[PDB]
UniProtKB/Swiss-Prot annotation, chain B:
Catalytic activity annotation: beta-D-mannopyranosyl-(1->2)-D-mannopyranose + phosphate = alpha-D-mannose 1-phosphate + D-mannose
Pathway of action: Nucleotide-sugar biosynthesis; GDP-alpha-D-mannose biosynthesis
Superkingdom: Bacteria
CDD domains: GH130
Keywords attached to this entry: Carbohydrate metabolism, Glycosyltransferase, Transferase
Protein name as catalogued: Beta-1,2-mannobiose phosphorylase
One of the protein's GO biological processes: GDP-mannose biosynthetic process
Family: Belongs to the glycosyl hydrolase 130 family.
Cysteines engaged in disulfide bonds, as pairs: none
InterPro entries from the UniProt entry: Glyco_hydro_beta-prop_sf, Mannoside_phosphorylase
EC number(s) stated in the UniProt entry for this protein: 2.4.1.339
Database matches in Pfam families: Glyco_hydro_130
């Protein structure tokens, strides 16, 4: 099965007037709480030079997190300043690719913090809220180069569940206290000589179903195209993949998906279940934001 | 198992000391054979090349210009008093370098390295175009990133313009609908460790079409930074797949003005054309002079 | 036109034994010799998990590798023993003896392994012992006194010269000796391949297996993400310094959970393979934790 | 018509002395001057083996080159001393002073050597000392402020200019000076030849020797497997920048066991050669471990 885009034009785009989202808005975390779609999007003040040996001050780019409430989920409302920015020098180049999970009655935002001192100088980072507004308690989740981090919305046997991507696999780990992680296991690997050969990473947090946890994920071919796949995690044991779909659910097809700051990228940091429907919010070409949907009942393996 | 043969063991173009532009080096030239004439567009430098400072320093500034030269025989060229292309301040303040010219339909495209001199990564691929080889227009940054060794394929593939470029250290391909926005970036060729082409490789001139594929002359740099040329063959209908790559170089520094010069141990081509079932390969030597070497088309087998 | 190894079991054939300190966490990277119609397995064994991310090897995370012995008729089911057959000498091998490769040359058996001192992450070298019975190892010497590993002896001399395969980072090396003590004629014989599974480094697997068309050179290849797979090349029979064929695609990759997950993830690694009844039996460590075995019919080996 | 050197002895003429820490492991790559009917030999000496295969020079494998003095009447039997005559200054030459080549220039003696700081593998440069008497050295300076080695001085000015041979990789370079501090008009003199015994790199051996027919340029060449062999070229007597002759094949190459096996296998390397009784004496390091001497009659030198 495939996702279907709602709009064949970006539902959000950069705002050249605001320096902080000047060149890019993409990779957005999203929650459905106030019967509205609460979208937290990566935003860049510059284009992305990636081919240098080390990140260069000449080509510095700063990621930021912007908010965007919407009632129907297609037309959004935005604000003049970011809702999250780097405040310690390990986020010098900013805060990237947030994933938001709410556990008990707190909202947790996992994102990558990038220091620009080298291309490994990035950390999984977490802040938390109780309202989605006042983000306190900054911590580095793992003291290691790692990203594509989400939290499972439930605890499993009283342990918090973190998904991450030690290169190039999707990993699970477990916490007593959201501080120390142990029992790191690989859960899913890239498949060679396919669209998902180079690496894979979780998209948005897994979405609970009756039959398992929905693992929307991205896959990178060895020409660095980002597409989206789908897999199912055992509900009792999210460390086991009980199914996974061969072909992708979303790949670059529109021109603002193929062409843009980093071409041939579709990338989701956030999905939501709304009206028997899944709403998948994907950065396109690391420049704009799109949204695509599936009818819950058409999800089958 | 072939190599080029030099038509002369002396430069065919050399710097002109009376001209400030082109006072110290003429090298890395684009080539078009149009209407019985060899149309040469040569990188030209007003100054020696000091590259061992931490940043480009004004006291060591060099300016690359593009000169033009024309010939009937490929050997004796008419030259002109002034360069046909120079750099726009600020992004091209230290000049415009290593042009590669591709005709597509009835237009001509000059991809070159604009260099701003504000740091050693202050360069990019740029493109200007003309329909006449005389009036260049429409400068655009091809990729807004530190990249070079770029050239356009002489025709489209599946309705798409084909860019070759060199994100360090490989030869990349890429595709465009509009000659502005590029996608489908793919690595196509890589250095080989423990060879003359171990440190890096880049495309030479644009690929020359054949019946058996695209002729991909390229340069390879060894661990000692020696520039040599070698050849590959790209698949005719998909130029991103290599189908043959010769092991040994086709041209390497051999003559004193290829080994010694402003940058020692360099032969470097930005251009080769087909004339009379021969391939003419023009090359800078030591980043200081231009020579030309040939190979009979019949001798190009892998 | 590529060939793969096929696993004999989807479960490991040797796993750690928790009553034995010297093997209570890992058994892997094993040499193998087939003699007296028995598979003789000399496996690496760790008393601890492997913390490798520290600036120096820390006593608080010390691991000790020993070499245990297992024997089998069918190459699948093994008899094991209480005590290891090789341990490290102190202090040069205080962190033990790793990745043994056993070569028989003229009714003497040569075990090459990495002695690891633990004093820093470069405190390792190629070591050798020998025996005439596979039981009483003697003659310890440092083959090459440098940080080096993935070493194996060729099963016969070439022009009167002993032949050593080693691995100065990141290529497979070769060298020659008149006396099994002093090595000369060093030469790179094979190199990693950029933008492939074997791009970071390569290293010999088990000692090469003689064929009519050359020497079978199973090797391991390390990708950018540190995944260890197995590949295969063919060496020239009379001049094993020359690679005359090399399969592009691996012959074995981490696939099963005890190969992908373990003390070191994403690892398949062979220190030994033997030929029995026109089949190649390749024993391999798996996630530096267990031992599996894959086979190939030799008629399927085609380059 | 190829010509080659003839070893005077199947024995080294200088060996390490294990009781002297500074020359414990290696004496090699020696300069030599013939003065006072004496062979004056200034030899590089190492306190340690040579671990060369690490990505970076590591203080745990540090080796220190000093330069020792030895004298002989007969050219074979040398008298030696307790302590070195020159050592590396900390920190610019922290890993010592290598490969001296001594040129006499109007009753002065100039010793050019490679100083090596061991902070990275390009942490080396050409340094120069001089003396009045081959005894009281002074005047130390960094000849070129760049990674460079294999340096010698011509024994007289050319057009009133001091002449320097150096080796910007991989070629032999020449350079000119007025003051022996500033060098200019650098240009490539000679280059390796791919797919021969001298394909990887070349470098000068001893300072050129004056002949009526030009300047004898013994040089070393390195093949794809880092074997070091001595070659011979001839430079125009009035313009030593022009190579007027070059023998295709080596004049010396590792043959004896203490030239094949050693701290650095497969190396003969000469930093000095003198003419005595119409005969060239070529002192050479062997395996970076010992010093030998090979000769060739003057009249046999022919291109
Ligand atoms: Zn505004
Ligand atoms: Zn942070
Ligand atoms: Zn990812
Ligand atoms: Zn004029
Ligand atoms: Zn420009
Ligand atoms: Zn590459
Ligand atoms: Zn290039
Ligand atoms: Zn070659
Ligand atoms: Zn027991
Ligand atoms: Zn040992
Ligand atoms: Zn290598
Ligand atoms: Zn290895
Ligand atoms: Zn593959
Ligand atoms: Zn003494
Ligand atoms: Zn010095
Ligand atoms: Zn040298």
């Amino acid at each position: 099965f495939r996702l279907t885009r709602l709009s064949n034009k970006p539902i959000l785009s950069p705002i050249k007037e605001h320096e902080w989202e000047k060149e890019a808005v993409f990779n957005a975390a999203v929650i459905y709480e106030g019967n509205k779609f609460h979208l937290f999007y990566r935003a860049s003040n510059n284009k992305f030079v990636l081919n240098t040996e080390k990140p260069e001050e000449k080509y510095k780019f700063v990621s930021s997190i912007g908010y965007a409430v919407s009632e129907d989920g297609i037309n959004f409302e935005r604000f003049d300043k970011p809702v999250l920015v780097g405040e310690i020098p390990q986020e010098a180049w900013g805060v990237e690719d947030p994933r938001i999970t709410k556990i008990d009655n707190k909202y947790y935002m996992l994102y990558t913090g990038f220091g620009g001192r080298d291309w490994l100088d990035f950390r999984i980072c977490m802040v938390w809220s109780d309202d989605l507004k006042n983000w306190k308690g900054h911590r580095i989740v793992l003291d290691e180069p790692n990203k594509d981090a989400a939290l499972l919305s439930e605890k499993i046997n009283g342990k918090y569940v973190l998904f991450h991507r030690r290169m190039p696999d999707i990993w699970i780990a477990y916490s007593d206290d959201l501080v120390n992680w142990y029992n790191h296991k690989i859960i899913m690997s890239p498949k060679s000589h396919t669209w998902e050969s180079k690496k894979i990473g979780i998209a948005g947090p897994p979405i609970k179903r009756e039959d398992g946890w929905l693992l929307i994920y991205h896959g990178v071919d060895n020409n660095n195209v980002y597409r989206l796949g789908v897999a199912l995690l055992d509900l009792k044991d999210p460390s086991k993949v009980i199914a996974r779909q061969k072909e992708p659910i979303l790949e670059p097809e529109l021109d603002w998906e193929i062409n843009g700051l980093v071409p041939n990228v579709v990338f989701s940091c956030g999905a939501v279940e709304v009206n028997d429907m899944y709403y998948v919010y994907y950065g396109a070409a690391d420049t704009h934001i799109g949204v695509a949907v599936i009818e819950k009942e058409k999800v089958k393996f």
